[PDB]
Ligand binder design. Structure first.
Ligand SMILES: CC(C)CCC[C@@H](C)[C@H]1CC[C@H]2[C@@H]3CC=C4C[C@@H](OC(=O)CCC(=O)O)CC[C@]4(C)[C@H]3CC[C@]12C
Ligand SMILES: CC(C)CCC[C@H](C)[C@H]1CC[C@H]2[C@@H]3CC=C4C[C@@H](OC(=O)CCC(=O)O)CC[C@]4(C)[C@H]3CC[C@]12C
Lengths: 788, 788
């Protein structure tokens, strides 16, 4: 029951008319061929063998000779008995035992002639494999085609017939005249393909007579897919063959033969998730003495720093510099270090996200209308956030995440992706109104156009760099560690270009001097929970619970959707998850930090996935032509600590971060908003609405359902999204999480009556397939339908 | 020997337990299947049938019933004789003769209900094509599978068994118990696949016994491709299956068994070419009473007007407005009408090209350093151009274009594409030089940035519109009628945007009032050949012959390559073309027209291709899943006349063409320069220089030759091109056609010394395949490896 490595040699004349047995083909899992003109290995492909060759092979084995359990060690030894019983049993007479043996004892030459190629090829083969050599050639001095099949009792390594030092178990030799109308190369290919299949060598092991070999051939024949003699003209061999083979194999085989579990005990989830990860604590600070962690932490720093200033500049601009970029950087370091040192899932990198920014900008306007302080409302919301977190954990309410399906996960992403574009365009339109474009700090000549030029330049540089990265010019291993390295290059290029111009004016960032708040005139370091400049109304210390529920829903969804995808069965995450502990450590820490005037934090979905797949290592011992598979993921909690410490220390360069114009940030904002739309199964279903049915794709949600019903589903999704967007534009904009949570009952009740269970299974398919920066045009953005 | 259309019915129970023989599959050339859940036709695919079904079919054909040469015209009668010979031939014993007859005379239900679907289907089916039906079913009261095969003596329609009104010749029916472990649907598919092959029905027509049918099956089996029972990954089939199929077919087939010619008569080319096109003169003006021509005229007018102003603007700008856009517009119409009235190939759209502009630019600087006059030099060059034209045709030599291969046909295009980009970037640098970007005609504030914005916007709009046009959102018939329709929209958008902003200054086109020269202060309407202001030197009377030779080489190459490519064999261009009446007409007209201070004209190869493939109509009677083929090309000489007349009359819109900013023209210039690089074989070979060999494509010039050899070929091309670029930048810039005519012998001599005859058949591949706006990302720019 071993693995078989097959090699097909041939007897072809050299440049100096030397017989010189030469290697022709090599089978491990799929066939590889050698071209005569370029003498290099080709790409692997499925071995498509003819039928007359199979018929000829079955016919000629009737008169062949078999040597089962042969006790020799060397090729000269085995050849003597082979030719002896060859002559004994009819084929080739006694007047030929001088030249047939001459052909067997010859020199074998390979094209790639402790080395490099040999070591690589041996690595490709499984560790414990047996080898087989098939020798076919045309000989002029024979009469009829003769065959000999042998099986050595003990696996013995030969001298030079093979390509790598692997012992042989079978040897198949075929010699015959060229007068007979037979293709010997095709017969050799057919017998190699037969020997390279499981059910044939598994019977050759147990074979003891020609009858067993004939039965094995017959049983192999009645499992194949015969193609007609019709010329193929393109993609015809993609609809039938694969699905037909899979269906036939399934039919032949069929007829042939929980962390999210309620326990009824208060605070049981915390105990269950702390009794697993913490025992393996010393294994988290010692399994990171490898170069891959050092390589990763360099590029994770940029990926964690770029959103820190992009989301901080807008927050500082909108809130009149009440919460600027300094607080966002300082808040990430304090919570990140605590989460890395004390958390259960250290692969999560926490940071400010999109929906939190939208909620903050919606809440800021609500306080301004009612003439209330903004910092104290946040701290009073923060206190109620801890109570809900403790209540939810004690009752083990984290199992509700199973009820959030793909129907809700994409409307949210589409909304958050439209918000960014609207914000960017509105900001541009406003800049074009502050400074009119008339002739010869308002009323400046070249501020209206310079901002547009910078925004377009940074957006297009980032877009084209992203397009270039996902191409054939980058190897898979270098494409996986590099976590979207286009933004740090576009920002640097635009800053360098803007630095050269020293005559015009443009708005810059608001980084302060030293360790101090961005606006050391309106607030201090601690926020008084009773009132800073005027008493806080007593009636909103109990009425602030309502926004607390909405922000808790947002944080809970954003944190629990990410953790499910990170910890799957396809990814080799072995130690343990943190479903219950992570929520507590993320909601309590943010509620505490809300006192010192710092924003809340979330799971940082895309950054989390990039960090998750930047530490993985892929298997190297895989057969060529097969899809790559994951081997193991390095689990440690020292790279997150280093990233958090570097982000925190990145505040000491405030003399450099002050030179960044406030237009490159909006260009990056628009770029992220545009690129977040990839991977959601709503955008392409909307694209399909503008195509003829003949051009529709071959995805799983078009073949199994009718077109009109799919269009109806898309129309319902559009109606829900439009209703929610219309609600958001009003003065009750502080309610959209409630509408987002009022769409799960709409799917469990209303949407179940219209559609059949089959269409719900086909369309609402929350299954997902992991990506590892393979193929073309697929990156970490395609993994999750959740926005950035 | 006719075509056969077969359909596979299958007895499947209805909703209310009704037998209702139902249609399951339909073969014309490739199989089409009906989906069970959505009951709609799927995409065509190759019929990949199993092997056990074939074996069972061969086994059960041994004791079947063959009603050869039946003489009935109704289904009840043929069913009566079928059941009669079944009960006679020991298939149904004694008690089942009416229940079986009950199943045969039932109602057939097709999944498609003077109509629409069958009118559409009748076109795809060949004209004199016979039809046949195969009926299979899993019934209980048989106790043993029974078969009947018939051949009606005369083709007779059989009411509603078929979905289209086409007579039937055969009908194959199979009934058997479900307790037999036979997949009846698979057997029906297999028998349909055999019946759809030429060598099987061509032997069933003249068969006389079941032995002939068995022999036909056996001969069909020994032509197929057997696939092993191994899972496919999607790409493993493309490498093997098609090539193996082709080689096996070639082996089986083997086992089974000038307009360019000098005569010796002076002016013989004109005599030979007049007697072919002029007899078919009245048909030219009568084969144009079709609705295609209106859309052709309008879209070709839009596609031919844009190059007139784009090339006219730069020529007017950088020649001190000696010749501008008005002269270019008047020159195109004056010669276009003459060529469309007296020409031999009226599909050529003559107009100003790139290389002519480059040569004019180089020549203008040469006359500004020797203190000569630019206009009179041109007219003295023009006189020598006619003499060379008359000498080159009387001594017939319009055959050296066969010696201009693809080696020297791509350096030219890449050179032009680099020249365009360099020109645009130099213009941008200069326009920034005149207007500095400091704070608060020269020195204007907003001219430096507005020009950049206008240049970038139009280029990006055109690029993205071209990318969108070649997607799957557009059908194959609307994509051919419209040419490059992104420029006429980008120009309009960027003119409308600039029109609103009226607070600043920017350079605009210089269009004069009425029919007058663009500079009515330094030149008139007729150029004096002896001198306008100062006497012209006499030593330039004969020293002007060399530039005449150079421009003659340029014009000859540009016209002859286009003439060769258009008049191919794949394109069904009837009547005849002319290689001798075109060159003489074009060169003589240009030489005479240079007297009045107007530029020369060329073939305008991309416009010629767009004109050629906009009048073509593709056949509709083609089997689904096959490559489209050309029915005919409408040949007429009234659309070119209309286009030329419209272009000429477009001069009265001088009050609107004066509002176009000059930066949009440079944006379009850069767009054309960038987009002209598609299709040249040198560019992808340059791309391959920076890619690992494992990711190399499967094109014909990588498999058959080694990597280092193609790298050396590309290095030699780069060396020659760099030498030509270096010599083009000196004070002798008007000598690069000499460099090209020198590098032509270089290919032959050196590359046959070095690279051997085998590789100089795939590296220097002049084959080229026609494009008809099919596939994805392929347009008229890929057809022609020449500049715009
Ligand atoms: C790209 C976006 C921003 C454009 C605006 C939204 C559309 C995609 C909306 C516009 C009107 C909608 C349509 C209105 C009516 C219908 C009926 C729906 O089917 C039925 O109502 C009954 C048919 C059945 O049940 O099978 C088919 C979808 C469709 C075309 C809807 C699909 C979604 C549409 C096209
Ligand atoms: C726009 C850029 C890409 C221009 C420059 C392209 C590459 C930098 C060029 C520079 C010089 C070139 C090289 C010049 C000489 C050779 C010989 C070629 O070798 C042979 O094939 C000789 C041996 C043989 O007989 O096969 C090896 C490629 C190489 C290094 C060439 C590969 C391409 C190179 C490195």
């Amino acid at each position: 029951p071993h693995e078989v490595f097959v090699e097909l040699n041939e007897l072809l004349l050299d440049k100096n008319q030397e017989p010189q047995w030469r290697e022709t083909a090599r089978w491990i899992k799929f066939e590889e061929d050698v071209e005569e003109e370029t003498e290099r290995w080709g790409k692997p492909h499925v071995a498509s063998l003819s039928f007359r060759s199979l018929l000829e092979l079955r016919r000629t084995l009737a008169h062949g000779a078999v040597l089962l359990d042969l006790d020799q060690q060397t090729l000269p030894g085995v050849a003597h008995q082979v030719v002896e019983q060859m002559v004994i049993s009819d084929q080739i007479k006694a007047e030929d035992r001088a030249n047939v043996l001459r052909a067997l004892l010859l020199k074998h030459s390979h094209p790639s002639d402790k080395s490099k190629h040999e070591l690589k090829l041996l690595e490709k083969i499984p560790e414990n494999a047996e080898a087989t050599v098939v020798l076919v050639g045309c000989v002029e001095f024979l009469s009829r085609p003769t065959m000999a099949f042998v099986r050595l009792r003990e696996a013995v390594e030969l001298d030079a017939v093979l390509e790598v030092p692997v012992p042989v178990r079978f040897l198949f030799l075929l010699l015959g005249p060229s007068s007979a109308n037979m293709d010997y190369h095709e017969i050799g290919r057919s017998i190699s393909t037969l020997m390279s299949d499981k059910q044939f060598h598994e019977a050759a092991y147990l074979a003891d007579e020609r009858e067993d070999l004939l039965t094995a051939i017959n049983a192999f024949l009645d499992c194949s897919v015969v193609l007609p003699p019709s010329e193929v003209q393109g993609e015809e061999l993609l609809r039938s063959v694969a699905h037909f083979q899979r269906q036939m194999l399934k039919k032949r085989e069929e007829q042939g033969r929980d962390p999210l579990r309620r326990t009824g005990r208060p605070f049981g989830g915390l105990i269950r998730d702390v009794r697993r990860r913490y025992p393996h604590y010393l294994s988290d600070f010692r399994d990171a003495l490898d170069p891959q962690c050092l390589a990763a932490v360099i590029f994770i720093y940029f990926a964690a720093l770029s959103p820190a200033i992009t989301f901080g500049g807008l927050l500082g601009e909108k809130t009149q510099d009440l919460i600027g970029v300094s607080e966002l950087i300082m808040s990430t370091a304090l919570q990140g270090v605590v989460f890395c040192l004390l958390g259960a899932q250290p692969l999560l990198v926490i940071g400010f996200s999109g929906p939190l920014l939208v909620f903050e900008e919606a809440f800021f306007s609500f306080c301004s209308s009612n003439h209330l302080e903004y910092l104290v409302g946040r701290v009073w919301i923060g206190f109620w956030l801890v109570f809900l977190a403790l209540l939810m954990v004690a009752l083990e309410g984290s199992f509700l995440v199973r009820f959030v399906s793909r129907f809700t996960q994409e409307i949210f992403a589409f909304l958050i992706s439209l918000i960014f574009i609207y914000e960017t365009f509105y900001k541009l339109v406003k800049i074009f109104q502050e400074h009119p474009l008339h002739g010869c700090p308002r009323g400046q000549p070249n501020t209206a156009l310079l901002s547009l030029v910078l925004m377009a330049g940074t957006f297009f540089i980032a877009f084209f760099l992203r397009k270039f990265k996902n191409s054939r010019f980058f190897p898979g291993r270098i494409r996986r560690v590099i976590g979207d390295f286009g933004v740090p290059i576009a920002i640097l290029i635009m800053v360098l270009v803007d630095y050269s111009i020293e005559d015009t004016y443009t708005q810059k960032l608001s980084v302060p001097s030293g360790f101090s708040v961005t606006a050391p005139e309106k607030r201090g370091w601690v926020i008084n929970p009773l009132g800073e400049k005027s008493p806080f109304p007593v009636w909103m210390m109990v009425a602030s619970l309502l926004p607390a529920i909405l922000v808790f829903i947002l944080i809970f969804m954003e944190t629990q959707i990410t953790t499910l995808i990170i910890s799957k069965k396809e990814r080799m995450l072995q130690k343990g998850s943190g479903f219950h502990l992570d929520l507590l450590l993320i909601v309590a820490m943010g509620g505490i930090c809300a006192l010192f005037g710092l924003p809340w934090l979330a799971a940082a979905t895309v950054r989390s996935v990039t960090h998750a797949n930047a530490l993985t290592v892929m298997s190297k011992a895989v057969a060529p032509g097969d899809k790559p598979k994951i081997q193991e993921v390095k689990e440690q909690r020292v790279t997150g600590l280093l990233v958090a410490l570097l982000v925190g220390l990145s505040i000491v360069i405030g003399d450099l971060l002050r030179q960044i114009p406030l237009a490159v940030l909006f260009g990056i904002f628009l770029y992220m908003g545009v690129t977040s739309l990839n991977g959601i199964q709503f955008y392409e279903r909307l694209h399909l609405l503008l195509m003829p049915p003949k051009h529709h794709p071959d995805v799983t949600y078009v073949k199994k359902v009718r077109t009109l019903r799919m269009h109806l589903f898309t129309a319902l999704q559009l109606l829900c999204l439009a209703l929610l967007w219309a609600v958001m534009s009003t003065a009750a904009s502080l309610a959209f999480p409630f509408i987002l949570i009022l769409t799960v009952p709409l799917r469990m009740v209303v949407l179940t009556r219209i559609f059949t269970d089959r269409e719900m299974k086909c369309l609402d398919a929350n299954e997902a397939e992991p990506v590892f920066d393979e193929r073309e045009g697929v990156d970490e953005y395609n993994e999750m339908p959740m926005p950035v």
